[model samples]
Target: MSLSLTAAFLAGVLSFLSPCVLPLVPTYLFYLGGARGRPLFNALFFILGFGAVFFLLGLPFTLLGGLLFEHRQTLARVGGVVLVLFGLYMLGLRPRWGVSLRYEGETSRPLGAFLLGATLALGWTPCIGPILGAILTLTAVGGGVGFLLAYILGLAVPFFVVALFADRIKGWLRRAGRISHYVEVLAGVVLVLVGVLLFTGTFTALNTFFLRITPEWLQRYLPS
Candidate 1:
């Protein structure tokens, strides 16, 4: 349960780097990070806003999973298919996965700052299925509320960290501009890999397969 919870949190954070979000993060930084005066504050508020929408959008899906544990397989299949489509989109084989239509303009007002974060959440929802599915695998098993809270906190922490360090990261990324397209390609490959893993329940299998061939002590260098 603890491991799965951790996975969920990490998944949420990693979602920010998924095919839908990572490519555009630089733009977000340029917009949010470039804000004058209260850049940091605005960034924090934006993160909060993003999380609010993320939790709100994800809540229904999570709650449905929690309530419909018997349908996990069907849900997994659906999520897997959608994720594969997302991968196709990343590969430039598909333009949209029916999720990009929700792309709305972000607001910069005090309250709207929160919406900016929510906008990010909304933007990533469909594209985040693979990672989020892995996280949901744990929560659907049932647990104490503390586990859920911790899971959310773990996943949400990345957004806060990225938002806080947006300026620095953006600068570094800008310097590595040539590699940016490669990163995009790699991200798409990862998305496809994750989608395949999700589809075949190969995530834990891959983890186990790696663990078997690698030295036990050295195995810790890579996730299991």
Candidate 2:
């Protein structure tokens, strides 16, 4: 099992869970649904916006990592500390994404939301760039790509789901809104777990543990 990918993905989901993006998701999903636009299609562009940035953000770091490859563990430990701090911040705390972009002379609003999403992606880069870069560089080339893909997919999948269901999701959020604080706390705990994993350089051990315990039927389906 590639526990690293799993951890990376979980970290992204934690991003979705954060005060940063969670509540805002439904709002923008609702906006795309506004008027004659296709919410699902527009939301896809929004996801594409941030997804593109993440891959590119890690691109230079991947090359630099190829050059500074030996600094892996030290870099990882520092990133681990930052991840834990982020977790605690999530454990402690809480955005406006509303804009009438269509006012700009009937432009492709999804494209409008596209750049909008990219800017939002930029907002969160500092959170992931340092450690995520360290991580990409820490591994082999194929490994690097897989983890990034997994991480972005983690966030994007649920996001697309929101796009697909923004209408009912509004009322869903009404119930979920009350429970949002605990979700953030849970996200914090998840980050803390992932942080310690990297902090101690136990990623391989984590992989081994998952490999042994996960069902054999499931084993064939996961990345090795």
Highest TM-score, which number? Answer: 1
lDDT of 1 by residue, 32-139 (tens): 334453555654565566456656655566576655546544444555566666556556665655665667656543343444444444333333455556666665
Instruction: Give the total clashing residue pairs for model 2.
Output: 0
TM match of model 2 to true structure? 0.45
TM-score of candidate 1 versus the correct structure, residues matched by position: 0.47
Give the per-residue lDDT digits (tens) of candidate 2, residues 1-224: 43666776656655654433453643443354343446676556656665677567656755676566465445435555555555555454422346555475555654545444443543343334455555764654554667666776676777677667767765775587658556544654654664566456454675444334334664466675
Clashes per model (N, Cα, C within 3 A): 4, 0
**Candidate 2 worst ten-residue window by lDDT:** 118-127
Best by lDDT: 2
Root-mean-square deviation of every model = 8.3, 9.9
Which residue pairs clash in candidate 2?
none
lDDT of each: 0.53, 0.55
TM of each candidate vs. truth: 0.47, 0.45
